[PDB]
Amino acid sequence: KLTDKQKSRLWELQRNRNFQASRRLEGVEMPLVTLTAAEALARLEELRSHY
Amino acid sequence: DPYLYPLDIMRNRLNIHQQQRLEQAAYEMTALRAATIELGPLVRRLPHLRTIHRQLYQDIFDWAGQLREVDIYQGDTPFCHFAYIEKEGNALMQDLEEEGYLVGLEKAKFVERLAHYYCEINVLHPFRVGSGLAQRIFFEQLAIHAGYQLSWQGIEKEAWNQANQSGAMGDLTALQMIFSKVVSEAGE
Ligand SMILES: [Cl-]
Ligand SMILES: [Cl-]
Ligand SMILES: [Cl-]
């Protein structure tokens, strides 16, 4: 994954898995987020409205 | 604590007044924000680490991205004194930059340097909440720029915290052992 586009694709493929596992190191079990970045932004907007 | 309302609860942007509900909202919102974080640059100093934290916490805290302003303990062990964070953080990032962000290294050497830098940043604990999360994203991205990839899967929390503590006291053996497992070749 030497190319900028290859590195970015790797990052996108792993970032959510990583955050789940990362949070587990803090002792918290959370479900895996499978949303795309755009979907996550739209869901964040709903959650802000909800609070 | 200046981060608390003048109660049991940290001041927050969501007008939540119950600590447990704030915790849960943070777990959910940080996880959605982490789904939007891009790889970022090869050249990464303290401002890039602050940007990760800002990204994660921008919905929750006005202070997202800002350095910690109080002292924090894990048990009886203090993290870096707050007034020293900027000086120590900058110095550490400068050492990292002089090592070219760990690029061009064979696996054993990468693991060794990574454990070292991970240990140093962990003691720094630059943010009031979420330091661990921001630090790990910073290093996950760094690894990919360096031709490696990190997985935190299957690392036990107790082993993780003990490894970091031993490392901060001068024996990086346990943290390097964890990193030998966490690290694999990029795209492998
Ligand atoms: Cl509430
Ligand atoms: Cl959190
Ligand atoms: Cl930077």
Residue numbers in the entry:
A (entry chain B): 3 to 53
B (entry chain A): 10 to 15, 17 to 198
The authors write:
The E.coli Fic protein EcFicT forms a tight complex with its cognate antitoxin EcFicA. EcFicT adopts the conserved Fic fold, but with a distinct active site signature motif and an additional hydrophobic binding pocket in the vicinity of the active site loop. EcFicA forms two parallel α-helices that tightly embrace EcFicT. According to this classification, EcFicT belongs to class I with the inhibitory helix provided by EcFicA, a small protein coded immediately upstream of the ecficT gene.
The G55R mutation encoded by the fic-1 allele caused cell filamentation at non-permissive temperature (43°C) in the presence of high concentration of cAMP (1.5 mM) in the culture medium. However, the EcFicTG55R mutant in complex with EcFicA (EcFicTG55RA) yielded crystals that diffracted to 2.0 Å. The best solution (TFZ = 11.6 and LLG = 206) was obtained in space group P65 yielding two EcFicT molecules in the asymmetric unit. Our crystal structures show that the G55R mutation encoded by the fic-1 allele, which results in the cell filamentation phenotype, does not affect the structure of EcFicT. The arginine 55 side-chain forms a salt-bridge with glutamate 107 of helix α3, which is conserved in EcFicT-like homologs. One could speculate that the glycine to arginine mutation may reduce the main-chain flexibility. However, despite the additional salt-bridge, the G55R variant is not more stable than the wild-type protein, as has been shown above by DSF. The EcFicTG55RA crystal structure revealed that the site of mutation is neither close to the presumed active site nor the presumed target recognition site. Also in EcFicTG55RA, such an intermolecular salt-bridge is observed (E28–R146). In EcFicTG55RA, the flap is stabilized by crystal contacts and is fully ordered. In the EcFicTG55RA structure, the base-binding pocket is nevertheless partly restricted by the conformation that adopts the glutamine 84 of EcFicT located at the tip of the flap.
